[PDB]
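Quick illustration for those who missed Monday's session on complexes.
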Amino acid sequence: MSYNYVVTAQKPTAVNGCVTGHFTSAEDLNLLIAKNTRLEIYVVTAEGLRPVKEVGMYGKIAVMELFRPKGESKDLLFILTAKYNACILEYKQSGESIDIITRAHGNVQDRIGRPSETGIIGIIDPECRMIGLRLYDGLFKVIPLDRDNKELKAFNIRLEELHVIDVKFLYGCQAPTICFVYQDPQGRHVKTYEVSLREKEFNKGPWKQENVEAEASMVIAVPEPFGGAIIIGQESITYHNGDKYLAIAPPIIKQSTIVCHNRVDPNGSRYLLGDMEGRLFMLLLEKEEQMDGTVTLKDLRVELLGETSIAECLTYLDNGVVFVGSRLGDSQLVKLNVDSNEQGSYVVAMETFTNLGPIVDMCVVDLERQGQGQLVTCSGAFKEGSLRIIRNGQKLHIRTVPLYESPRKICYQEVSQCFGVLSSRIEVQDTSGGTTALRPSASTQALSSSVSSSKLFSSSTAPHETSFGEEVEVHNLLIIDQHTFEVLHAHQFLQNEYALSLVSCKLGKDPNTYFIVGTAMVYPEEAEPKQGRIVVFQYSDGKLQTVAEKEVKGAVYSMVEFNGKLLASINSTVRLYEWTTEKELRTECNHYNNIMALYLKTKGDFILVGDLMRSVLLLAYKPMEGNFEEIARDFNPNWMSAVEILDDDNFLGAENAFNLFVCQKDSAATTDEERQHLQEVGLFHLGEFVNVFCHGSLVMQNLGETSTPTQGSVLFGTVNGMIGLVTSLSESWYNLLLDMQNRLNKVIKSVGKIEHSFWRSFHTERKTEPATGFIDGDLIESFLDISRPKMQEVVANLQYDDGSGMKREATADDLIKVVEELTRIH
Amino acid sequence: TKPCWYWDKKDLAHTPSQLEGLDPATEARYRREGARFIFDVGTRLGLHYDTLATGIIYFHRFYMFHSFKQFPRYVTGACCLFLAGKVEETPKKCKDIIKTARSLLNDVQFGQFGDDPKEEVMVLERILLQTIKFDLQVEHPYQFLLKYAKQLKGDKNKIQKLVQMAWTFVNDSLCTTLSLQWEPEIIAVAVMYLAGRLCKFEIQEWTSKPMYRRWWEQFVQDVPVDVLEDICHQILDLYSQGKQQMPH
Amino acid sequence: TESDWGKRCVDKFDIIGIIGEGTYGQVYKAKDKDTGELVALKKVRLDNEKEGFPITAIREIKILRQLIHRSVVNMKEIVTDKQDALDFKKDKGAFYLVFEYMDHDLMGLLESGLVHFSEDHIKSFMKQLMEGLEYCHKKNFLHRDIKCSNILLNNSGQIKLADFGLARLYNSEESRPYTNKVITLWYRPPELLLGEERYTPAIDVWSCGCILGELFTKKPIFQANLELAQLELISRLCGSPCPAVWPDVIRLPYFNTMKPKKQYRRRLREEFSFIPSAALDLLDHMLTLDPSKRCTAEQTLQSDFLKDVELSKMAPPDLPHWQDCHELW
Ligand SMILES: CC[C@H](CO)Nc1nc(NCc2nc3cc(Cl)c(Cl)cc3[nH]2)c2ncn(-c3cnn(C)c3)c2n1
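Prediction with RQL bound:
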C-alpha cells in the first residue's frame, strides 16, 4: 500500500458564480462570490467590498441562489453541489461570533438519469414556493419550499423536451411558470409550462411556443412591470410575452458570443450583457405607457459601455459599481459613468482581484539563486493570458506579466537567462484573404521576430477553404527575459501548425543548449492530426535560429529529455531519438501500445506514459538492447489530465473527473503478471482539474529547516487557479493522521452537513469508491483553528505507533505542534 | 478452414505403425484394445456415450499421425478420454482416470504409464491437441441414428428393435477404422441398413416416401449401396472374427 | 494448410504490448510479420498442470471455430512457443489463441467517459449485438458472461462479442444442473440470483437489456456488491418477484430466503421516461423478471426500435478525438 498527503498552497481563485442580496442582515447589501468549493461573503460599501466571512464546503458549488420566503426577515442561501448535495443556509451572528446554519440538507440524486449537456440548472420561484432543478435529461425536479421539508425531499415531473438549453421562472404569472429554450431536430424553440405542486405535474403554459435563433443561449426572466422573457443568442436578442414579440439584431453583438447577463434596474428597464472578448453592453428596455394605464415594451436597444475582463458572472452592486467575476482572467470592480471618457468608454477599472486563471503549464525556477524556488505559471486565456511569478513571503507574492494571448507551455533555459513560452493568438479572416488580430499581443510586440519558412508540408494539394470572419489560432514560441520579463523574440509557426510541446536541453555530445518544440498540423477536416514537426531552435545573441527539423506522422503531444536523447510521443507512438554529430535527429526505438500518448515523464531509464483512456504505463529503456520494454500498466480505465512520478515504485495521476490516484508496482515477483500489473493504491477526489504536475517547493530553504515528516514535493496547477502539493508519508505517520481525520470529522461541523468521507470519495459518473492512501491535509491543518474543547475531544484515546514508544497517548498540545510543522511544507 | 479427417481404406496400409514393421492384424488389434480400454474406463466412471466416442475418435485419429511403437496405446487412450471429458463437458480428474486404469489393466499393461502415470498422461495432452489440429468438435453416428429414426412412423416395437440393434452396431464400429473412413451420417444409415437386413424389415415403408426403395437417400445424399455394404461387411467381420454373434 | 493449428510459432508475430490480463494467461496485442494484420494473442498457460489445458480455453476454441458471424469474434489460429526439440515432457511452452484486434472495448470507452451514443448509434449497436446473440442462440449456445468488457468496437462501428469462456450448450428437452452463478452481478438475471441452475438463453437477454439502459444513462443500471442488494435494486425498477408476475418463482430455491424490503411495483417506464418510446418497450420486455415472459433475441430484432435499422449505415459512436485532448476554455 502507499501513503500520501495532499494540501492546498493557493485556494481556487477563478470566480464560478456571484449573487447579490440581503443575506447577513435584512439591512446590508451583500455580495456572495463562489469559487470552487469556497464561499466568500462581502458587504457592499461606497468604496468597495468589506469582507465578513468565508467558508469552505465539502463539494463543488454548482448552484448558488438567494431567496427570502414569506416570514423570514432576511435572505436564505440555497447551494447545490456537483455530487448532488442540496442545502439551505442561514447567516447568524452573535456579537463577534459568526456562524453558518444548515437549515435543511439532502441529496437530490436519482438512481437512473442522464446528466444534462448544459449542466445543472437551478432556479427559484419569485414567490419562493419551490426550487427548480434540471439535473437529468427529460426530467424536471421540484423541491417544494414548505416549512416541513427540512430533508429537501423532491419529486420529478416528466419533461417531453429532452435537450434543454436554459430555463427560468417567470414573473407575473397566476401559477409558478417556467420559460425555457430547448433543442429538437427542427431547431430551437421557446416554450412555457405551469408547475402544480398539488398535482405534481406540468399544465399548459401561459404562452405559445415560438421558434427562436439556432444558437439561443440564455433566458432572462423580465420583472413585473414588463413581464415575459428575453432570449439572448449569437446574432439577436428577442422579447417574448404572449402576443408581444420584439427582435433586435445589432451587428455589434454578432462579433463575440454573449455569455453573461445581469439586471441593473429592479423594474427590468436595464440589463447588463457581457461577451467572450470582454466587452460590456447595456441592454435597454424602452417603455411605452398606454392611456389604459398599462405599461408595455416598446423597443430594445443595445449600447456598448466598454471593456472588462472576460466574465463568467456579472453582478451590479450599487451606484455605478459592477463586480466582474472572471474565470479566465482577473476579476474586477469597475465603475460605470454617465459621461464617456476621451476614448469613448464609460467603464473605468477600480480594483483588480488576482485570478491565477487556468494554469495550463508551470515550472519551478530559483531565479535569485535563493535555494527557495519561484513558480512561473502559464495563466489565463485570450486577452487575460499572463505569466505569473509566485514566491512565498504569511501570504504569497504574485507578479503578473500581461501577454494578451493564450500561454500554452513554459520551460526555463538558464544558459540564456530567459524562458521559452508557447502561445497562441486569435486572428480572424479579413477581406485581404489573410487574417487580422483583434488586439496586439506578446507575439506581435516582440523585440525581434521570425516566421517559419519550412517546406515540409508545402506540397499540400489538400484544399482548406476560408470564409471571412472565421477564427484561426496563430502559434508562437516566445523568448522572455528572466529579470525584465520582456518579450525578446517571437517565432511564428506555420499556418495551421499548433505548438504542443516544449523542452530546453542539451542533446548527445552537442554542447549547445536548444529550445525544442513539437507541433501538429491540424486541419478542421481531420479527426486526429496526421502531420507534425519536431523543431530544434537555438536562442543566441537575441535571435532564434532553426538548427534542425524532424517530420513526424502525427502530433508531438509531449517531449522529454532522456539521458541526452529526445523522448517524444507522436499520437499512439512513443519514440526515442538520438542527436547525431550532424545535428539531426535519428530514431533509436519505438513503443506503440498506446491509444494516445498525451503525457510523458522520466526517472532514470524509466518512463511513465499517460494515455487518453488507458491510464498510465510504466515503460523502461533497456540500453543493452536499444529498445523499450513494458514494465507495468494500470489496466483500470481512466481519462488522464496529468501524470507524475513520485519515486521508483509509486506513480501519480489525475482524472478528468477531478480525481487523483496513485499506482504502484505490485512488487510480487511470483508471476510475471503481478509485476506487469500496476495496482491503484491511492484514490482521492481533489475537486480540481489538474493540468500540470511539477516537482519542487516554494518554501524557503536556509538548510536550517527541520526535516518534516513529509518526504518529497510535487506541486500541481489547476484550471480554477488552485495550487496544491502532494507528498509522501511513512506508514506510521499516515495512520496517525488518518485516525486523526476520523476524529476530526466527528468534531468539525460541515456547512450543509456534507460528510467529509463522501466528499473525498473517488467519483465518476459510473463509480464511487472510498478514498484511500491520501490524507486530506486541509482537514488536518484545520485542527489548529478549532476551539480548545474540541481539540481535547479529538485527542481523547489517541495512540501513536511504530515510534520510540510503541503506544503513546496524544495530548492537545502535542498535536498542535505536529500540525504546525505540517503547515511549514508550503 | 477445417481439416480433412477421412482416409481411404487403402491408405491404412501406410500408417506410421505399419511402416515401422507392425503388420495389419496387430494394428487392428491394438486399435480394438485401445478403443475398448477407452470405452471400459469411461463406462466405469459413468461417462456419457458421446464422451466415450469423442475419446475414441481422438484415439483413432492420433494413430494416423504416430506409431503404436513410440506411443503406448493405453496412455494415449487415457489421455484421449481425459481431454474428451473436457470437450464434451463431462470432465474427470486425471487421477481418477488413472485409478480406473489400474483397476482394469494388468501389471504388464500398466507398465506403459511408467513410474508416474498421471504425468505421462498430462504431458501427452500437448501432443494430442497439436495432433488433432485443435479440431475438437466431433459428431457421432448416435445423433443421426436418432434424428433419422424419429422420422420413421410405423410399428413402435419393430422400429425400437431396429434402433437398439443399430445402436449396438455403432458401439461396435468404434473399435474399427470406419470412424476414419466415413462421415458419422453415413455410419448411422449403414447400421440402420444392416439392422433392417437382419430383422427382415423394409424401412422404406416407414418413410414419408414409401415407394422410394433407396430409403436412405432422403437422409444422406450421394451414398451408393457400395458404401453401405462395405461398412456392413466390416462390422459383421468383427462378429465373425470373435466368438460373439449378431445381437438380434 | 490453413487448418493445421497448433504448429505455427508465435515468432510470426511482433508483440506490441499487453492489452489485458486473463486468469490463465496474459493477453497481448501483436502484428503479423507476414501480412501486417493486427491481432490479439491470448496466452494459454498449461504449465500449472493442475488440470492441464484450461477448460475455459477449450470451450472458447470449441465454440468459436463453429460460430461464424460479423458480430462474433473470430479466432484466426492457435500458435505456440518455440517447443523443446524432441522432449515433450520437458516442454512447458504455452499456446496462444489468435483473435482479430479490435480498436476499443466498451467498458474502457464508457469508463473513460470518452464515448457518446445517439439513438441511431444505439440502434446500430443493439442490432448487431442481438443479431450475434440470435446466431448463437439458434446454434443452441449460451454466452453466460455478457458484460461491457466483452463487447468490442472498431472505430467503424462494428460490434463483436468476445469472451466465450463460460459458454455452454443449451438443450430445451434436457435440463441438467449448470453453474448457479455465471454472469457478473451487475448484469446477472434475477433467475440466477435465486439460483435456478437450470436456466434458459433468456439470461443473456437480461444482460443486454441492462446494457441497453446503460447506453442511454451512461451509467450501469443495477450496480451492487451483494446478490441480495442487486435483487433489491432490480426489484425497485422491475418490480418485486411475486407469483403473479412469475408463476414459477416459488420453485426457485432462494425465493423465500431472498426477499426485497417491500413488494415494489414496476416503475421501469417512469424511471426511463427520457428513453424513446420504441426503445423503452424493448427495455421493458428485455428486463422481464419471468424468464418465459422475457423476450427472445429474435423478438428484439423484430421490434420497432431495431427492425427498420439498416446495418449498411453502421453509425460510428462519438469516439475520442484530438479536441478531446484539449480543454474548452
Ligand atoms: C483482454 C483485454 C481487453 C479487456 O477489456 N479486451 C480486449 N480488447 C481488445 N482490443 C481493444 C483494446 N485495445 C487496447 C489498447 C491498449 Cl493500449 C490497452 Cl491497454 C487495452 C486495449 N484493448 C481485443 N481485441 C481482441 N480481443 C480478444 C482476444 N481474445 N478475445 C476472446 C477477444 C480483445 N480483447
